[PDB]
Design a protein around this ligand. Sequence first.
Ligand SMILES: [Zn+2]
Length: 7
Amino acid sequence: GSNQNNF
Ligand SMILES: [Zn+2]
């Protein structure tokens, strides 16, 4: 799967 981190 794809992963995204938005701090
Ligand atoms: Zn993955």
